[PDB]
Amino acid sequence: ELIKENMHMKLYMEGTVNNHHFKCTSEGEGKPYEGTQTQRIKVVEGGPLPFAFDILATSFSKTFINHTQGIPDFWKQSFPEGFTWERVTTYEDGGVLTATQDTSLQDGCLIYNVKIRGVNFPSNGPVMQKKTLGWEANTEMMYPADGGLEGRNYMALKLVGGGHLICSLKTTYRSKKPAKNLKMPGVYYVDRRLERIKEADKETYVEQHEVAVARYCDLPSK
Amino acid sequence: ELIKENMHMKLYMEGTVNNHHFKCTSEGEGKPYEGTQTQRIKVVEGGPLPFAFDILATSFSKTFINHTQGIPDFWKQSFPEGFTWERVTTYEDGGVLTATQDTSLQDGCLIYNVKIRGVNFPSNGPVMQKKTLGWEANTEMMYPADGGLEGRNYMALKLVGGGHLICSLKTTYRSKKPAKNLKMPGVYYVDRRLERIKEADKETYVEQHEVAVARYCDL
Ligand SMILES: [Cl-]
């Protein structure tokens, strides 16, 4: 089909956090219907980043969610035109990060273009001091809003010395497909796990893996 | 164990939303270890309420969570002394609802005292116009923090005509028991479904059911 059982991706990302400009690129692959993917990510400008790579991590792929049960797949059916997404992540200590991304398809390859703008990350905070250790696994709540799809969630960023830095994510997802051709889902939930395969040179190379599964609440109902 | 396989509860609630004062009481029972419970709730002052009963729903019970896998049960282990919770719920259209709750155990019955303050609900929004149809199921993120437990989540309130009103919940769970005697859990999640069972006399009488299960992420 148009999204094959195996798909490749290339990504270009540019942004600023606080006032440090950077670019990353990446290349990877995964199994869109199995909900798995890997990306090999290089910092290509502004390295080494003077902030935790972790704050970029959720910016690097919605087509790779395993949509179980009934759930119509908003993203896989957005092709060939593809889709966009836009997010504000608000950290409880200050730090706000806006990400905006364009997903498109050329020659059976998925192309991501992401822009990042983060501000007010505290100078001696764990993000700017690179004192972080990855994200807990978690659940994005998906619900229809407008002629688009909206996601809400709280993520917990593991800290050196234990404890967590908490942030909220507010995401708006829009298709570029007419809408009349689009079977939009009801409310559902996406269980995700973000992990690293390997990293090196002060995180200027990071290989990142995601498992994502879309579901209805499995609890029984009265 | 002093939290048994079936437990009863009685609740007292007072508060004010958008300057409308109200009081509620409730009684109920459930199965703590299976994570189920029902409450039968009455508005005893200020009824009928000029705002959606739904904004009060999460303020009516943490002892009744089915803790699966490893997870140390903060709440069940908290007795006989019991615990408190306190919460800010912030609606994306302005509405802030603050709740402060005391949970006790007395004569084998669970006792809840709850106080509530709601401000800035838009006067023509779905809350003050009672256009709401209950809460989607959700998962609360639980983590150790500040000597106790904090909870984070977003909840989605169903509106007439099919849309949702989103709010964030920020909760601190404080145990009255000395922290030395508690086995503290790591990061975990609590899947909940809160379902209206019945509603009479313009939400002046409400039956409400919850099912709640603690777990880790299973992928
Ligand atoms: Cl997300």
Side-chain angles (χ1 to χ4, degrees):
Chain A
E1 209 223 22
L2 203 51
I3 299 301
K4 294 111 152 65
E5 217 174 78
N6 267 283
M7 296 297 282
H8 295 297
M9 59 204 131
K10 295 185 214 260
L11 165 149
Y12 308 86
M13 160 191 293
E14 176 177 49
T16 301
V17 166
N18 287 11
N19 57 333
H20 187 92
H21 176 259
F22 65 97
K23 283 181 172 176
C24 303
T25 53
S26 92
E27 156 259 321
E29 57 293 304
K31 301 227 207 73
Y33 307 92
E34 286 183 46
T36 58
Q37 63 175 306
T38 298
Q39 272 179 56
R40 298 167 280 282
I41 299 156
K42 313 183 176 181
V43 174
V44 166
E45 205 165 282
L49 305 168
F51 52 84
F53 185 94
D54 279 324
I55 69 181
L56 305 183
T58 57
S59 287
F60 291 97
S61 185
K62 329 286 330 192
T63 314
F64 299 87
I65 298 157
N66 171 27
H67 281 72
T68 61
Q69 288 156 317
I71 310 155
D73 198 315
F74 182 84
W75 298 283
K76 286 192 195 71
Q77 77 186 258
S78 289
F79 300 97
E81 295 94 335
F83 62 86
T84 60
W85 67 255
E86 217 169 78
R87 185 183 294 147
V88 206
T89 302
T90 311
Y91 287 75
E92 291 183 348
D93 64 356
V96 173
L97 191 138
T98 58
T100 67
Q101 192 257 214
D102 181 286
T103 306
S104 63
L105 181 66
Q106 273 113 292
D107 270 56
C109 189
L110 297 163
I111 282 76
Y112 305 158
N113 265 285
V114 200
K115 288 280 186 71
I116 297 294
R117 202 142 317 273
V119 304
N120 295 347
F121 286 85
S123 275
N124 276 281
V127 166
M128 296 313 292
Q129 291 309 137
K130 305 186 77 164
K131 293 315 217 151
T132 78
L133 296 170
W135 297 97
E136 305 284 4
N138 90 318
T139 307
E140 191 184 16
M141 165 179 73
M142 299 299 306
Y143 62 99
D146 301 39
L149 220 62
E150 280 241 42
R152 290 288 183 285
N153 74 111
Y154 272 98
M155 280 179 78
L157 176 60
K158 283 159 71 182
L159 299 175
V160 165
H164 290 86
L165 182 57
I166 303 297
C167 64
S168 70
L169 288 61
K170 290 187 265 269
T171 321
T172 32
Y173 307 94
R174 338 190 104 94
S175 195
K176 290 180 270 181
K177 167 149 289 167
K180 74 211 174 205
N181 248 30
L182 233 170
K183 195 184 199 295
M184 282 213 194
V187 174
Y188 66 106
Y189 313 81
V190 186
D191 290 332
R192 327 188 275 347
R193 206 177 72 218
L194 194 48
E195 41 195 35
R196 291 186 176 176
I197 297 184
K198 53 176 90 151
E199 64 183 271
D201 195 19
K202 306 284 170 49
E203 298 184 318
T204 52
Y205 181 109
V206 171
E207 182 160 358
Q208 172 169 309
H209 182 74
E210 176 175 2
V211 196
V213 182
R215 53 148 187 92
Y216 293 126
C217 175
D218 72 302
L219 276 45
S221 84
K222 259 147 53 69
Chain B
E1 230 325 286
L2 71 164
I3 292 298
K4 217 183 43 64
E5 203 167 287
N6 297 82
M7 286 290 277
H8 285 276
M9 69 209 106
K10 269 162 180 150
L11 165 155
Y12 300 83
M13 168 180 293
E14 184 170 14
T16 310
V17 180
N18 274 25
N19 254 106
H20 181 90
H21 181 269
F22 72 89
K23 265 179 176 148
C24 295
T25 62
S26 87
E27 44 101 16
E29 60 286 317
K31 309 190 185 192
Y33 299 88
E34 296 160 47
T36 51
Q37 63 177 301
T38 298
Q39 284 181 44
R40 296 170 290 281
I41 308 174
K42 306 171 171 189
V43 178
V44 298
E45 194 168 330
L49 307 165
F51 57 85
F53 188 93
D54 286 330
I55 70 175
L56 295 189
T58 54
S59 295
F60 286 96
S61 176
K62 297 279 164 175
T63 307
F64 292 88
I65 295 169
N66 176 20
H67 280 62
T68 72
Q69 293 152 14
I71 316 145
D73 198 309
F74 186 81
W75 295 282
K76 289 177 204 147
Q77 289 160 218
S78 166
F79 297 97
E81 296 92 351
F83 54 87
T84 62
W85 63 260
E86 63 190 41
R87 178 181 300 141
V88 64
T89 298
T90 309
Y91 288 75
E92 298 196 331
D93 67 355
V96 181
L97 193 136
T98 293
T100 58
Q101 201 262 23
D102 180 77
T103 295
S104 287
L105 173 69
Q106 196 201 49
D107 300 332
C109 185
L110 288 159
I111 302 218
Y112 306 159
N113 267 279
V114 201
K115 304 230 207 107
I116 285 176
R117 175 59 68 167
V119 305
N120 298 330
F121 287 82
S123 63
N124 263 317
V127 174
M128 305 304 296
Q129 292 302 300
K130 318 245 220 72
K131 302 196 174 166
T132 72
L133 295 176
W135 298 99
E136 306 285 4
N138 84 116
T139 304
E140 179 180 27
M141 187 179 54
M142 297 296 315
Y143 56 97
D146 230 353
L149 293 186
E150 284 174 11
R152 288 300 183 272
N153 74 123
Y154 275 105
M155 275 183 82
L157 180 55
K158 292 181 271 205
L159 303 182
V160 298
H164 289 89
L165 181 63
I166 305 309
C167 60
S168 66
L169 286 60
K170 293 160 93 160
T171 308
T172 304
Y173 304 94
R174 300 171 199 287
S175 175
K176 277 180 269 182
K177 201 176 203 156
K180 45 166 91 172
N181 307 302
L182 279 157
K183 201 212 161 62
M184 286 302 193
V187 182
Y188 68 98
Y189 315 79
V190 174
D191 299 337
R192 309 190 277 354
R193 203 196 260 101
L194 194 164
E195 292 164 290
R196 181 70 74 74
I197 305 301
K198 152 176 193 170
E199 173 283 285
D201 303 346
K202 305 297 158 190
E203 301 188 322
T204 257
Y205 175 81
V206 171
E207 301 193 2
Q208 185 172 296
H209 178 97
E210 193 194 325
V211 49
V213 179
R215 55 142 183 85
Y216 301 112
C217 250
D218 48 322
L219 282 71

